[PDB]
Structure formats: C-alpha cells, structure tokens
Nucleic acid binder design. Sequence first.
DNA 1: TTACTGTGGGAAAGA
DNA 2: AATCTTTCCCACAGT
Length: 435
Amino acid sequence: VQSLTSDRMIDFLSNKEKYECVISIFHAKVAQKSYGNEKRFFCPPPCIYLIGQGWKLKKDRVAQLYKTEQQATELVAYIGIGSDTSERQQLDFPNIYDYCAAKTLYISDSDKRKYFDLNAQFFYGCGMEIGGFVSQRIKVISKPSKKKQSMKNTDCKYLCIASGTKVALFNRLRSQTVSTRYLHVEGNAFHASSTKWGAFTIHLFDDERGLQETDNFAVRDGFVYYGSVVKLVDSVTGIALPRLRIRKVDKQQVILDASCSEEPVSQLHKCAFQMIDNELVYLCLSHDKIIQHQATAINEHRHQINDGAAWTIISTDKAEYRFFEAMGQVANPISPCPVVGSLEVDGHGEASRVELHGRDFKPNLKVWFGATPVETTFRSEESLHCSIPPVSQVRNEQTHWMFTNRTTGDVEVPISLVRDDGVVYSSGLTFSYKS
DNA sequence: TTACTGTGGGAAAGA
DNA sequence: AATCTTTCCCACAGT
C-alpha cells in the first residue's frame, strides 16, 4: 500500500516544480571557536529557505488531514550542532515559501569537535514531524589565519579561497554585533541586509602580463590572492559587481605593500574592494546602501578607509534536499533524504548494471528510470546497484515526449530513488540510453 | 547609571 | 630562529 504508481510518477515528473518540496541550507565552511564563557556567533548566520509551491500543497494535506491551538499547520524548526540536543536553538521565521536564519549559534572550546555540521529538524504546530536535514561540513578554527605566505599541506579546502567558489561579505561597525550587515541583492540591486545574505561566486581573473615582461613564471594555483581582480556574481540572480580588486585591510588602513600579493586571502580576513581605474575608490557601505568611496592616501603603501568600506570575507556552502510524497502523505518523517553523488555504469552486455554512490541510502528505496522501477539491491548507506531496464520498456506513447531528446532523438530518463511509502527523491541525475 | 556582553586586538603559550 | 596557531585577557561600544 502506498507503493509509488507509474501514473503517479508521471503526474509528478511532468509537474516537478509544482509538486517538489525543496529545502536548502546555507552556511559558512568555517566557524571561529568560543573560549571560556564568551559566545562568538556563526556569521553569516546559517539559514534555510523552503522553496517551491510543493510546500503549500503539503500545508493543506496537513491542515485537512488535521481536522480529523487552532492553526497548528505552521512550521516549528530547530537547529543544532551535530546530533546533541542541549543547544538545539529554535529557528525564527518570490517562490520562497518560507525562510529562517540561526543568528546566535556558537561552538565552545569544550567541544572536542574538529569538524561538524548543522542539523535542522522541522515540524508542524500540531507536532507533526517533517524531518531533519544536515548542513554541509564545517571546520572549526581558533582565529582567522595570520599566514603571510602559502603552505602546501594546509587543507586549503577550508582556509584558502578557490577561484570559482562562493563567499559571503559582511560589514560590522566598531566591533558591534547589532551593526553587522551582509551584502545582498534585493530588487535586482545590491544592498546590505541585517537578516539575509547572499552567496557570491568569486571569479578570479588571471594577470595580463606576457611579452616584454619575463620576471616571474607563474602563481596560477587558482586561489585568490591579495591585489587580484575579482568579479563577484550573486549565485541566486545573475547580478554582479564591477570587476574590483581585493586588498587586505588592517585597522582602517588598506595595506598596499608590494609584498601583500604573496598572501592568499583567508577565512574571516578583513578586506576592501578598490576600483580598477580609480585605485583610490572602494566598494563602500552606507545606510544599507552600496556606494563607491573616496579614500585618502596616508602613504604610498597605505590608505585611510572608513569602517563602511571594510568587509570580512568568508567561504560559503549549500546543502539542498528535494522530496515529494507522491502517493499518500506518509506517517514517518522524510528525514533521511538519500543523496546521490554519481551514477556509475559498469559491466556491459545483458548483465549491464548501474552502481549508485551516495549517502543515506536505506533498504526501503527502489531506483526508478523515469516511470520504470527497477530491481534495486542495497549494499550500504553509501551504495546501491540495479540493472538497466530495456530501452523499449522505459517509455510509451503517454511518455514518449518527455523521455526523448528532441534534438539527438535519444532516450534520457531522470533517475529517482523512491521510498516504499511513495516518497520521491529526484536524484538530480539523468540516465541517457546512449549507454 | 550599573551589569552584562559580542567582538576584535594583543599577550603568552604551544608548535 | 622565526613564524604561526591556540589560548587568554581585555577594553570598546552596545543592549
């Protein structure tokens, strides 16, 4: 009972946007630890967006299967470090069905944890439990690195900033928490919110040397160094900033020392963004308004910038989970959402198989090819394998359209993992029969 | 006004 | 050694 039905799968694939429940968590890849009683909060604040109409259908299927205090069809969310429930802080609250940010999380030196992740649990007012979802991995740091050179081993994965990764940028007035503001596009224009922040892909531009100049030979490691032309695009909506140059700051002074360029930018470093031309102007903040700014020289290797033009930069990550209760509205939470990493196809002939590598797989999942459910063998929460269904049976007239590449004319079916009580999880992957 | 509190900078210690 | 990380200490400007 409740096992997903081919027709019901088709209703869903053809209405993915409308039906699909999407939950996304954003946070920084690193977090400074708190010593003693102090509390050094995670900035930007981890937040969650419940995207898609799918959530409203769910609200109803709730409100109605409810009337069987008043309005207990509301969301109650909780977030915490790892699995412990001591510091389970309660979460506040276009096609954004709901949002929320944890603004006062912190991690104590008493926690021997060296890496960690955040766990957000959701429920309806009536106490109905939707599920728990984890953030991506977070490394703990003692303080922003004062490295002046670049190291080899140092897991740059967490301390350096790679050329196409995303970052948050925030301003803060004279060490005052309630003054923090995060760069954020609102109304296709840049601003500085106090509760929201955007992730910006940071594009690195190689240096136009060449020719006559034959001094160095390279520095091309992909990372972002000081004195670098960088373009910041808002990962959410194409909007971008004028290819600015990143300079390291130190107490209202933008150091230009002819050596700074050997220093890779790092997690939580303070910095400023000067114009390519007028290397005397900097991206500045003013009453939650992004304006350019004039800076006095105060030296040839220095500058005098106001607090409004100094930003703390930090690398950012995202975790997305997608689900749909295709058949009824299950009694169990969705909680362990399987995540598919890659789909491997080994062994050919008639015994051709597909290996699915991911996380949180469970024995109650069958892999589907479009609307064709195959035989699924569970290896481990990180491994599943099945057989490819015969092209011929992977689609009919009712579905010819959707599973055929209008161009190449080939069969391409979306891969989903369906849980025995009818919950569908888009893999995000596509199996083309080109085989 | 007094008590308490994130934050950024510095000292001292550890590596 | 010389430099960076970790831990402590603390004053600034705010609730």
